Design a protein around this ligand. Sequence first.
Ligand code: CL
Ligand code: CL
Ligand code: ZN
Ligand code: ZN
Ligand code: ZN
Ligand code: ZN
Ligand code: ZN
Ligand code: ZN
Ligand code: ZN
Length: 371
Amino acid sequence: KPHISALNAPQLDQRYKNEFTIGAAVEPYQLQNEKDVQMLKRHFNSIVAENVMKPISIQPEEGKFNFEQADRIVKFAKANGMDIRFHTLVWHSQVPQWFFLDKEGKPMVNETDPVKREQNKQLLLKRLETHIKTIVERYKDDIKYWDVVNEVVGDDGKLRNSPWYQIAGIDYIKVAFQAARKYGGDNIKLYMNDYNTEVEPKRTALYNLVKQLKEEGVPIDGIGHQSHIQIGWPSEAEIEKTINMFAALGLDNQITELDVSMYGWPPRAYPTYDAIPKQKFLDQAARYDRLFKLYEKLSDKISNVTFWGIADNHTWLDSRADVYYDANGNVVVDPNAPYAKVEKGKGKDAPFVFGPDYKVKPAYWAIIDHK
Ligand SMILES: [Cl-]
Ligand SMILES: [Cl-]
Ligand SMILES: [Zn+2]
Ligand SMILES: [Zn+2]
Ligand SMILES: [Zn+2]
Ligand SMILES: [Zn+2]
Ligand SMILES: [Zn+2]
Ligand SMILES: [Zn+2]
Ligand SMILES: [Zn+2]
């Protein structure tokens, strides 16, 4: 199957249009790029902001809201008939730090007086409610799908002990969902998004958490499975088990940040795209073939599959693509092999079905067909 321009190729969203939407994560500058715009128009019918809707992008100082960049993505989506996902109302990553300072400008996490800790909790929950209120009041008629909370369960199966949790306890999760519903109404759909949703003990902890919130009347409509995965892990069998169990609780499932890395964890990357062997792309294609056959099998439980990017010339996985060198200066990609130095984040991953020259990869043909 030829390495043809993806602008010449059968439309990916149309292949899946009765099964689920097909989305991409974007940065506003990509909307000024001819090739990226043509890619979005041709292949995608859902969009998400890679970064300009995160809390520090939207309210970096209290009372200073920057919707300019987010508005550019919303405008493009509407003009092209695309669904929008909001990434994300609450996350421990890069919080604007003002959220967690007390009235005296000290870190709330250090407060030891119980009465004052309770005061800090209420202050923080109020700041949280105002952040969500302002964003949802602006976009409730434009954005259908919301990552209300992100990564709130730890890899150890305990709630993540971020300042959110330290200062306010489980109530910051409840307040985030209740505020989203209060200001956006019944028609926006509210998700808890996380990575490694297939992996125990995280999986069961996530399951028990959303079960509990629902039994208490907290409005949660779905789970977002980031799906930052590898060629071999996690198995399709375990992805299937995961999606089924959340569906059994009455939740929608979205695949929200899909990328299929060429590497293991921690990655030992090639320094450049050209150095990645051809066989890796065939292995990746087989993986995508199996993955999307599975997503189709479960399409009554999945409303959306979003890739965390458009084509391989731009992927956040490059930030993880550490290049290992031996004593002689040769690149080392075997995880158990000797090495002398590492260049963190300087290598190249290749996670999508579209290559860096916007031509289709073997993985594209593997998911555009009906086999
Ligand atoms: Cl990135
Ligand atoms: Cl190429
Ligand atoms: Zn389309
Ligand atoms: Zn090159
Ligand atoms: Zn190249
Ligand atoms: Zn579906
Ligand atoms: Zn990016
Ligand atoms: Zn090429
Ligand atoms: Zn296939």
